[model samples]
Target: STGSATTTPIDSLDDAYITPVQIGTPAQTLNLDFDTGSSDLWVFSSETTASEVDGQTIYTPSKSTTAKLLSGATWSISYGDGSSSSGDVYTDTVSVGGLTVTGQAVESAKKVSSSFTEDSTIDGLLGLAFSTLNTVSPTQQKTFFDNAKASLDSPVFTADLGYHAPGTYNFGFIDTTAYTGSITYTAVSTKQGFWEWTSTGYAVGSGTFKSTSIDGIADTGTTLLYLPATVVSAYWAQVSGAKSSSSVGGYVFPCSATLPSFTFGVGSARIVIPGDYIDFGPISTGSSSCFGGIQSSAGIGINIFGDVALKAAFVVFNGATTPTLGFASK
Candidate 1:
């Protein structure tokens, strides 16, 4: 049988998507962020500090009949934005959508950064990256996908992330009805435990496509499309009143500007991000200033094709022997 499941997105701030996941025998449900950039299935739990718990639903291992403690196991993870979480480990029957895996490592967070504490909508994170990136000490744990891949007819999953709308994450097989046109396949290089690849180059609006290579990761966990500073400057240049604002952070432009579309090349395929997606949202309520979704990946060595870019396409994250990325117009 082709073990599979379909995840529905929960209402969020548009920065991330959350899906419901069940853990343990009694099946306690928690809303988790399906992150492609990192690997570790962690949750806000009874172990967390009372003050840090906020409004998040905690995963109580004691409540689960099948939960087992992984003695001496611990995990700590720090994200690109400096937000972090650390905790002990428990093994439980974890399920996503309709697929289930027994003895899945579930990291129960004892401490969390203020960023996570304030984001009450998300109760945890379900990592979709490689198993090698797992954070469990003593012995690294496999992700929910890796643990269930052997039973799947196809080792793959597709992400259909939308813009302030409900999206779906399908496991094991791609739903042909979710996307339009043919999917453009690109070989993925995972030396760094990420879905890394090089974009042939990019074009600003209807400008000529330059052949400069930009290596980056397809990270669903990130919110913006982060490219090289030079590339970001060039894209903003096309806007009449765009400026890099320190106080506002990143680049901001007049809300009335007619933004241009951004295009990136993947092999022979050209993926275009519409102008409206680039002009993120207003800087503030009833303000004339707007923030650009495309920013500079200055400190980070690799660029990130985050939600701003992924939302424009139907993404396939293949987990076969030679993992690949397949993109098609939504």
Candidate 2:
């Protein structure tokens, strides 16, 4: 059955995102960041003292009839963004776009930063990326898709992103109406927490780079898509009067006009990134300024697509079907 799941709206400063599930409940619906960077569903609890949850939702199994916290299990996750949270493991009967799955692993945070603490609306994050990022123990962790796939007649999930809207994000069965044909799947490389790949070269707008070879990871968790030094330099050069500038956080650029469009080809799948993504704002109290998708992280060995790239395409991650990754329109 194609179940119609209720949607919960989340409004942020820059844009508004959405969730396919109600989280906890009205009195305490866990407002979470639906992320693809990690494959773990985590929330905060009353046990977390450092966090200032004035109006934020907290999951208390003692309150919800459908909530269940796993005993004798704990988990902690840290991101490259310098943010970390950890808590005990639990299970709950979760419903997403008409698909309900029970005994799903959920993490609770006892310690979190103010960015997460001050947000009265955000409760936690729901990871929909891949199974490699699961925080629960190897034998304990169960992903939402893995559990729901058995219950739903058409088990599929899709994400649609918008710049500023109430339901900018939606997840559920693959909406065939959104795309033209069958979803293209790419083989998944057995990488660590990050998704890695090697691009034969780069291209911005209609311009193509047939001479350079770059390899890196694609991360939806981050906001900016990072590339190799040569790739980034060549990209900005296409933008008229655009030059590299340094700030407290990283590299940045000042452009006087519209930036050029760029697309990076992964095998045969070419994902495009707009020019507005080039001018990342100033870094907080740092000398390294932040450029949109331009930076000198080439020395790090891998490039990360982050959220900028994910928002532009329908990324389908598959672990059951030969550990693959796919992209579609939605």
Candidate 3:
């Protein structure tokens, strides 16, 4: 049977999405971020320092009879935003929707950075990237999807992230009804343990599409879309009153500015991100400044088609012999 799970926005549509995941034998459910950028299933757990965990639910592996600790195994991970979490490892029965994977590595967080402690709603993160990226030491661990792929009808999962709305993640099978039109497939290179691919080109507003190659990863965990500095500057140039803000750390513009749509090329297909979506809400409440969702990937070596860009289209993450990215209008 196929597995499916509904994901809901945490604070805003541009922030992050969380889905319920059942772990251990007694089926302790936790809200986890299905992150495509990382490969470790980590959760806030009873082992976490009391002060380190705020209003988040903790996974108590001791309560589950099936939980088995992997002695000396540990995991630590840091994100692009500087958020981090580290913990001990345990093997447990983990299930997402209807798919269950036995002996999946469940990293129980013993320490969390301020980024995670501040966001109390997120209990953990389920890494959807390749298993090679898993952080468990001594011996690498397999993700739930990796362990369950053999039983699946097809080694594929579809991400239908919505803007300010709920979306569904389908595993083991693709739901054709969730998308319209034919899916445009692009070859994916997994050398970096990410679903990396190069975009043919992109255009700002209704401008001509430049054939500049953009190499990036389809990162669902990231909040905004990140392109080259030149591309970001070109897009912001179209909007009046848009400027780089030291306080905001990115391009910000007057909240009333009329933004232009940003389109990126995937093979022969063009996925357009609406103008309104590029305005990632206000930089701060009560402020007349708004942050541009598309930013520069200066420090980060590769560009990222984060949630902002991914939400514009239906995405298929095919984990076949030749991994491919299938995109279509939602």
Candidate 4:
């Protein structure tokens, strides 16, 4: 797992970071964020005139050499973070990794609130996680993975999310050099929804901790992982010299210290989350006292593993088959 120093205002993303997607009959290019926790593609459009989308980038059909818009459709989306955006619906061609998908349904936000509008860097969101979270229920809509599956050489589309400092979300195909072999996968639960899995408890240091029944879910949309306080406190205690401070109502830790390594067993495979991955973001009150990866969000439900934990392994969301999540070294 890789970890980096935390900085304020957390770099806002740039236009280049937006994934190109197609929509409507004529097909237009729209910028979107690749989100793992949720499954839905949304973009800001010229139709939205509610507020001054001032700095925010909106996809204009005329700007793209090829663009189109669907007629008589509407869409609205709400995030767990209490942020929301809504707009008219349209279909167009979407492209990523040099691949193009036609007839892609897109949400052209007539109005965008929350930090989405404030963040000039990100134009929209691209749902890359399980299809269960897709705004279009019953699996009728074509997702990025669904659209790209036929174009890919393999049965998967890998998400290599890299942070080149602060404000950059770079995604690329899986790099074989980054991992040992093919990724291991586990069937996801469709009834409960969300790309969730049963974690084989918690393990710290060299051995498995007493807490083994705990379950975990991998979420890319979330900035940090939300673990049970009991397990979090216990695991941190085992770390050589772990420290924690409060900020954003969560704990942050230093990356320099020797953090206790932990693993979450999904079936036979044990996905290890290295020490460095746990130490993300900066400390709130103290300069040296960084925040720990594990934070207090008990009421938020089980564990919500975020990018910090995902960077350690090559994550593959097999929404096309059994709604599963695969993990391998990278």
Cα lDDT tens digits for candidate 3, 1-330: 579999999986459999999998789999999988899999999999999989999999999999999999999999988888998999999999888888989999999999899998899999999999998998999877788888899999889998889999999898889988889999999999998998889998999989888999999999899999999999999999999887779999889998999999989899999998887778777889988899999988889999989999999999998899998987
Q: Using lDDT as the measure, what is the rank order of every candidate, best first?
A: 3, 1, 4, 2
Q: By lDDT, who's the top model here?
A: 3
List of clashing residue pairs for candidate 3: none
Error of 1 at 233 (Å): 1.1
lDDT of 1 by residue, 1-330 (tens): 244444444543367888889998799999899999999999999999889988999999999999999999999999999999999999999988788889999999999999999989899999998988999999999998889888876899888888778788878888899888889989899899998988889999999998888899999888889999999999999999899999987999999998999998888788899888787668888899988999999988889999889888999999999999999997
Off by over 4 Å in 1: 1-13
TM-scores of the models, in the order given: 0.96, 0.81, 0.98, 0.77
lDDT of 4 by residue, 28-84 (tens): 545556676666787877876747475766777556544545565566678877788
What lDDT does the true structure give each of the candidates?
0.89, 0.60, 0.91, 0.61
- Taking the tens digit of each residue's C-alpha lDDT, what string does model 2 give over 1-330? 444432233543222243645444323455566666677888877667643556666677667666676768887888766677787876776666555666677677777776677666667777766666787763457667666655555445555554333333333455666555556666556566544556655687778655455655555445667777777777777766555554344445543456677676656656666666454443344534334555657545567766556566666555454455666533
Judged by TM-score relative to the true structure, which candidate is superior, 3 or 4? 3
Better by lDDT, candidate 4 or 3: 3
Give the distance in Å from residue 108's predicted Cα in candidate 1 to where it truly belongs: 0.3
Off by over 4 Å in 4: 1-31, 50-54, 62-68, 130-132, 136-140, 150-153, 163-175, 207-211, 239-248, 252-258, 283-289
What is the Cα root-mean-square deviation between model 3 and the actual structure? 1.0
lDDT against true structure, model 2? 0.60
